[PDB]
Design an enzyme around this catalytic site. Structure first.
Site, PDB file in Angstrom:
ATOM      1  CG  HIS A 250      56.775  28.478 -40.872  1.00 27.78           C
ATOM      2  ND1 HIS A 250      57.011  29.154 -41.645  1.00 27.78           N
ATOM      3  CD2 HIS A 250      55.653  28.549 -41.683  1.00 27.78           C
ATOM      4  CE1 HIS A 250      56.223  29.276 -42.728  1.00 27.78           C
ATOM      5  NE2 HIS A 250      55.492  28.699 -42.539  1.00 27.78           N
TER       6      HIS A 250
HETATM    7  C1  FAD Z   1      44.553  26.391 -38.414  1.00 33.15           C
HETATM    8  C2  FAD Z   1      46.621  25.152 -38.157  1.00 33.15           C
HETATM    9  C3  FAD Z   1      47.845  26.116 -38.012  1.00 33.15           C
HETATM   10  C4  FAD Z   1      49.170  25.886 -37.855  1.00 33.15           C
HETATM   11  N1  FAD Z   1      49.516  26.732 -37.535  1.00 33.15           N
HETATM   12  C5  FAD Z   1      51.024  25.971 -37.690  1.00 33.15           C
HETATM   13  C6  FAD Z   1      51.975  27.247 -37.096  1.00 33.15           C
HETATM   14  O1  FAD Z   1      51.908  27.973 -37.270  1.00 33.15           O
HETATM   15  N2  FAD Z   1      53.830  26.301 -37.320  1.00 33.15           N
HETATM   16  C7  FAD Z   1      53.789  25.076 -37.448  1.00 33.15           C
HETATM   17  O2  FAD Z   1      54.822  23.730 -37.979  1.00 33.15           O
HETATM   18  N3  FAD Z   1      52.474  24.687 -37.939  1.00 33.15           N
HETATM   19  C8  FAD Z   1      51.462  24.605 -38.022  1.00 33.15           C
HETATM   20  N4  FAD Z   1      50.408  23.891 -38.246  1.00 33.15           N
HETATM   21  C9  FAD Z   1      51.046  22.459 -38.895  1.00 33.15           C
HETATM   22  C10 FAD Z   1      50.938  22.386 -40.095  1.00 33.15           C
HETATM   23  O3  FAD Z   1      50.009  23.252 -40.915  1.00 33.15           O
HETATM   24  C11 FAD Z   1      51.126  21.139 -40.377  1.00 33.15           C
HETATM   25  O4  FAD Z   1      52.346  20.189 -39.169  1.00 33.15           O
HETATM   26  C12 FAD Z   1      51.979  20.685 -41.832  1.00 33.15           C
HETATM   27  O5  FAD Z   1      51.132  21.153 -42.737  1.00 33.15           O
HETATM   28  C13 FAD Z   1      52.213  19.091 -42.677  1.00 33.15           C
HETATM   29  O6  FAD Z   1      52.579  19.298 -43.510  1.00 33.15           O
HETATM   30  P1  FAD Z   1      52.280  17.563 -43.942  1.00 33.15           P
HETATM   31  O7  FAD Z   1      53.205  17.540 -45.186  1.00 33.15           O
HETATM   32  O8  FAD Z   1      51.963  15.923 -43.556  1.00 33.15           O
HETATM   33  O9  FAD Z   1      50.507  17.829 -45.081  1.00 33.15           O
HETATM   34  P2  FAD Z   1      49.863  18.949 -45.126  1.00 33.15           P
HETATM   35  O10 FAD Z   1      51.126  20.438 -45.426  1.00 33.15           O
HETATM   36  O11 FAD Z   1      48.627  18.731 -44.365  1.00 33.15           O
HETATM   37  O12 FAD Z   1      49.328  18.637 -47.201  1.00 33.15           O
HETATM   38  C14 FAD Z   1      48.726  17.570 -46.864  1.00 33.15           C
HETATM   39  C15 FAD Z   1      48.457  17.759 -48.607  1.00 33.15           C
HETATM   40  O13 FAD Z   1      47.763  16.564 -48.644  1.00 33.15           O
HETATM   41  C16 FAD Z   1      46.054  17.035 -49.539  1.00 33.15           C
HETATM   42  N5  FAD Z   1      45.237  15.536 -49.718  1.00 33.15           N
HETATM   43  C17 FAD Z   1      44.769  15.121 -48.672  1.00 33.15           C
HETATM   44  N6  FAD Z   1      44.807  13.829 -49.082  1.00 33.15           N
HETATM   45  C18 FAD Z   1      44.630  13.690 -50.262  1.00 33.15           C
HETATM   46  C19 FAD Z   1      44.762  12.606 -51.465  1.00 33.15           C
HETATM   47  N7  FAD Z   1      43.765  11.411 -50.918  1.00 33.15           N
HETATM   48  N8  FAD Z   1      45.493  12.714 -52.526  1.00 33.15           N
HETATM   49  C20 FAD Z   1      45.594  13.691 -52.354  1.00 33.15           C
HETATM   50  N9  FAD Z   1      46.155  15.130 -52.213  1.00 33.15           N
HETATM   51  C21 FAD Z   1      45.480  14.492 -50.906  1.00 33.15           C
HETATM   52  C22 FAD Z   1      45.678  18.139 -48.990  1.00 33.15           C
HETATM   53  O14 FAD Z   1      44.829  18.773 -49.816  1.00 33.15           O
HETATM   54  C23 FAD Z   1      46.743  19.076 -48.149  1.00 33.15           C
HETATM   55  O15 FAD Z   1      47.266  19.885 -49.722  1.00 33.15           O
HETATM   56  C24 FAD Z   1      49.018  24.188 -38.492  1.00 33.15           C
HETATM   57  C25 FAD Z   1      47.863  23.721 -38.874  1.00 33.15           C
HETATM   58  C26 FAD Z   1      47.016  24.243 -38.507  1.00 33.15           C
HETATM   59  C27 FAD Z   1      45.499  23.265 -38.849  1.00 33.15           C
END
Ligand code: FAD
Ligand code: FAD
Ligand code: RXS
Ligand code: RXS
Ligand code: BR
Ligand code: BR
Lengths: 489, 488
Positions: free
Chosen positions: A462
């Site tokens: 992705h």
């Molecule tokens: C610059 C960048 C580029 C990336 N590019 C890619 C790519 O090309 N392909 C890929 O596979 N991955 C990529 N990633 C990685 C991907 O973004 C993450 O792996 C993914 O978003 C993680 O999903 P998750 O469900 O763990 O949490 P996230 O999608 O990070 O969601 C966490 C959410 O929790 C919320 N939150 C945090 N603390 C609290 C709280 N205390 N109370 C309520 N809400 C809270 C935050 O606001 C956030 O919206 C990239 C990351 C970055 C930083």
């Protein structure tokens, strides 16, 4: 002069013939001769050492489609902030053709160099034909009365002369060209008609559309209702829309009846319907026919099919033992990697003691239309004739980057066709940027009898277009004993 | 106070998949907490998660924009003529189009909450009060005003990760990728700190949109960038970034940063070298986002590295509390988090125990040119298997001899268990590599062998057909040691 003797004589130094010859000499130590009519690309005979793909086929057309794609790139770049003087933009066709000619000639020279270098692998220049079961004659022209340059004795003979454009017998056909001449046009045509609904007509329509001078127009005509017969129908309809959206006029249910010259020297096309069109070039791309006429196959009794190809069994054997045929001359799948596969399989069988037949099913292929097609396996209407229950998984959407680029008409289409009784993937069909690159490993999947669950269980990369293939779990619709329906009964 | 089958802290990649599936597939009552309804300052991530708001989605759009610097130059070899001196890259237009695209996704997610039964969104900061109670507050401060108290049969922790900032004097004068997405102007001189994909990707972005006279520098504390990727590709992408004007400083690490009178930054490296830049972007790592959750209220155990400890089914040490995604400090990829969320709900709310497979996950780096990879690199395979073969193909494609970008070598490598031909890894560098690699991921789930690849008929002309043309190993590893030919 004495005649020369070989284990194998190959007539045609093209995609299949060169694979067979190189493999027989370098892998199995056989003595090989290969015949072709020309040592480098272009008029008079267009194909040459390297074959149709190298000289007037896949290799130069892909370079020219790549050049044509910059028309889209330059315009789409503005959505991402790129600014430049739009009025200054010019598409220089002479530079494109000169760059292409140099690339092709470099390949010609490298093939020439390897024949000079390689033990037991010899090249002969001229027209090859069959005199007897074990003698190939090489003459100065296609005319069997022309002078004899060589006689090549052969234990085994491989016919690999490819195919040639078909020209319809209409008044004024002499005013028209084929794809061979299109590769050498001195100037890009202002108005051009491409005649045919197949991949060569569609691909050249895209090339001419990008390089046409100011106020030019590209028209594609096709005698039936929908272009690109044999491809997925959703994709056939979408490609038509996206060609139209980029300024190409598509005349379906139309077919030239005659061509004449206007007083200014332009071509006046009259269609069977009585419509007329004035253009500067008419390119016929209605089909390609196997090149058998010049081989004098009557001398040894090699059988042709009703269609006109050399008849072969699964191991590429003709009805004359020790004479074989591969590639476009067999008038089946006309693709360079199929010809190469057949050549390698034949040589392994004849000289390698390891029998092998080419698998003509689940072959991945592409159309380098703008935007392109990548496909492998069965279309759904074919599968519905062979399987009691067929499922179709379909995703179609304009990718986000093209909502910024301005090309909102560029929908990506991904379709998976299954045997719903057990999940086996019968075919995958793609339309959009990257589709030819995405489909290659799909071919490996189908060779391994992948099921829809193997695709869905795989974690996506992705963000890509390809990840749509791994995110489809519920059929969009079905075929039940041939009948299309949204739901199983 | 309100009752729910599942409460999800974090409306991100994994949390939205888990909540949507729990509600629409199993009919459960679901609440999902996030700190912001749309993208950008002050909290950056928002409804949709890191990928949507400050991650994969906007960065891919920006890399696509940066690729046009190459397309404009390369079109000339194919006959395109225009006034080169009139070309300029409008960063503000880029950021504005990106912002509109992300906001559209935010709004889309908003309507989906509104339209779906048993699926409610709550704005604010969530933390654990008790084993079955989640509290939502106004700020990250555990003393801020309580907005909701959500009792839950099940709790899912899915708060993602956050940029790691080193403890050096002047760290406060540096930015992270969060701020890079919202810079008013494209930096003229920028230092990206780190060898990983985020630093490398932004280096390419800044390199295309930099004003005249500009310069991008990337620094990395060890000898070769992109640790964990194929070594041939690490060296090649280093070469191709340099060929496009990016300075790679290896074996260098910032020791301090100070403010210059003109607003720029003065970086001092551990080696004593100095560099003045307009922006210093720290991209050295991302760490699990655990600090605001009050895990001590209930005793959720962490690993030494700071992730929430989980078993293969995403369960913590506390029954009924689960964690998925970057907070578990494993593979930090959006599709892995989505997969984990779906497996979790199928295990808990259906009669379907399901665990995510973290091996053979395909992924990409949108460097210019990009990387696509799936499975093991050869030196990791060489520790796990007695005989490893490496098949290698590396050349400049014909189109780039004409384009003039002769430095753009395509690289394709296949790593096998040579004892039975099983494909262990596939690694690609070049145009199209992320698209090519997707179905390779499917191949590895059918125990494909190198012979399955080379007996497949190629699609011609493509870069991908190189994967079906490799018969003969280039070299081997035997009992861990690299050698051109086998002992027997
Ligand atoms: C610059 C960048 C580029 C990336 N590019 C890619 C790519 O090309 N392909 C890929 O596979 N991955 C990529 N990633 C990685 C991907 O973004 C993450 O792996 C993914 O978003 C993680 O999903 P998750 O469900 O763990 O949490 P996230 O999608 O990070 O969601 C966490 C959410 O929790 C919320 N939150 C945090 N603390 C609290 C709280 N205390 N109370 C309520 N809400 C809270 C935050 O606001 C956030 O919206 C990239 C990351 C970055 C930083
Ligand atoms: C415009 C165009 C675009 C194409 N694009 C693609 C594409 O993208 N992908 C793809 O897979 N395929 C493509 N093809 C098809 C591909 O070119 C053919 O399938 C392939 O070249 C057939 O290989 P072959 O070995 O049968 O014959 P060829 O490669 O055609 O070689 C036959 C050779 O025999 C020589 N010859 C003929 N008669 C004699 C004789 N009597 N004596 C001596 N030599 C003789 C000819 O000069 C020629 O060099 C394209 C074809 C065309 C026309
Ligand atoms: C270099 C190479 N490996 C595989 C095919 N080929 C092409 C080739 C070149 C010259 C002569 C022949 C014959 N005959 C074949
Ligand atoms: C429509 C969809 N299928 C999978 C994910 N999503 C996105 C989505 C949007 C809003 C809330 C949620 C939750 N919870 C999920
Ligand atoms: Br011109
Ligand atoms: Br290192």
């Amino acid at each position: 002069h004495m005649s020369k003797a070989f284990d194998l004589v190959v007539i045609g130094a093209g995609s299949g013939g060169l694979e067979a010859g190189w493999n027989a000499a370098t892998l199995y130590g056989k003595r090989v001769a290969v015949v072709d009519v020309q040592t480098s690309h272009g008029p008079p005979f267009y194909a040459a050492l390297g074959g149709t793909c190298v000289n007037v086929g896949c290799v130069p057309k892909k370079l020219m489609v790549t050049g044509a794609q910059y028309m889209d790139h330059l315009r789409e770049s503005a959505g991402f902030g790129w600014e430049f003087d739009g009025s200054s933009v010019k598409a220089n066709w002479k530079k494109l053709i000169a760059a292409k000619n140099e690339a092709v000639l470099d390949i010609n020279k490298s093939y020439e160099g390897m024949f000079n270098d390689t033990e037991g692998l010899d090249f002969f220049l001229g027209w090859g034909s069959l005199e007897s079961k074990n003698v190939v004659v090489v003459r100065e022209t296609a005319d069997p009365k022309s002078a004899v340059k060589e006689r090549l004795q052969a234990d085994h003979i491989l016919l690999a002369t490819g195919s040639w454009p078909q020209m319809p017998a209409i008044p004024g056909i002499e005013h028209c060209i084929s794809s061979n001449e299109a590769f050498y046009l001195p100037e890009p045509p202002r108005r051009v008609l491409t005649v045919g609904g197949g991949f060569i007509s569609v691909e050249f329509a895209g090339i001419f559309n990008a390089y046409k001078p100011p106020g030019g127009k590209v028209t594609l005509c096709y005698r039936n209702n929908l272009i690109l017969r044999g491809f997925d129908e959703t994709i056939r309809e979408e490609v038509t829309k996206q060609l139209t959206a980029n300024g190409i006029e598509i005349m379906t249910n139309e077919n030239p009846a005659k061509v004449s010259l206007n007083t200014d020297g332009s071509k006046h096309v009259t269609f069977e319907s009585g419509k007329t069109l004035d253009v500067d070039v008419v390119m016929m791309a209605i089909g390609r026919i196997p090149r058998t006429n010049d081989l004098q196959l009557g001398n040894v009794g090699v059988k042709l099919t009703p269609k006109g190809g050399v008849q072969v069994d699964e191991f590429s054997r003709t009805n004359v033992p020790n004479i074989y045929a591969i590639g476009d001359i067999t008038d089946r799948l006309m693709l360079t990697p199929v010809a190469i596969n057949e050549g390698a399989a034949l040589v392994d069988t004849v000289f390698g003691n390891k029998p092998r037949k080419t698998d003509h099913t689940r072959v991945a292929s592409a159309v380098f239309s703008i935007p392109p097609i990548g496909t492998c396996g069965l279309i759904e209407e074919v599968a519905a004739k062979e399987f009691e229950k067929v499922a179709v998984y379909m995703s179609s959407f304009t990718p986000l980057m093209h909502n910024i680029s301005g090309s909102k008409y560029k929908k990506f289409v991904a379709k998976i066709v299954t045997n719903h009784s057990d999940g086996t993937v019968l075919g995958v069909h793609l339309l959009g940027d990257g589709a030819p690159e995405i489909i290659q490993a799909v071919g490996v999947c189908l060779r391994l009898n992948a099921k829809i669950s193997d695709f869905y269980n795989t974690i996506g990369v992705h963000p890509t277009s390809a990840e749509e293939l791994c995110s489809m779990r519920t059929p969009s619709y079905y075929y039940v004993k041939g009948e299309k329906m949204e739901k199983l009964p």
